[PDB]
């Protein structure tokens, strides 16, 4: 599908509300495997199971290992821009 | 593959 830019708003007491799988060491993108109901990704409306996370706040995640992506993603605060694509 | 909740 088309590459999309999606905005997520979260407070500091919350996580993103997504489960991710995949990563470069497995030869696949960082993939959303769950959107947790009522948490920030669900509330933002534009992120879905099966989306590959290509970048967050301008940081490329296309070639990131799983744990690298966890560190980068969990560092982001407040108004967070995602670049995603569903395949 | 591993899965992480974040």
Author numbering:
A (entry chain A): 284 to 370
B (entry chain C): 5 to 10
Reproduce text from the manuscript describing this model.
In previous work, we have investigated the binding preferences of a PDZ domain that is known to interact with the C-terminus of the cystic fibrosis transmembrane conductance regulator (CFTR). The CFTR-associated ligand (CAL) controls the apical membrane half-life of CFTR and is a validated therapeutic target for the disease cystic fibrosis. We have previously described a peptide array-based approach that enabled us to design a selective inhibitor for the CAL PDZ (CALP) domain. The result was iCAL36, a decameric peptide with sequence ANSRWPTSII.
At the P−1 position, we coupled trifluoroacetic acid, 4-fluorobenzoic acid, or 4-bromobenzoic acid to the side-chain terminal amino group, as illustrated in Figure 5A. All three peptides reveal modestly enhanced binding affinity. The modified lysine and the terminal moieties are oriented similarly in the complexes with and with the additional P−1 substituted peptides. In addition, the substituents increase the contact surface area of the modified P−1 lysine residue by 69, 32, and 40 Å2, respectively. The P−1-substituted peptides are the four highest-affinity ligands, and rank-order switches are found largely within experimental uncertainties. A limited set of four organic acid modifications of the iCAL36 P−1 side chain revealed modest enhancements of affinity.
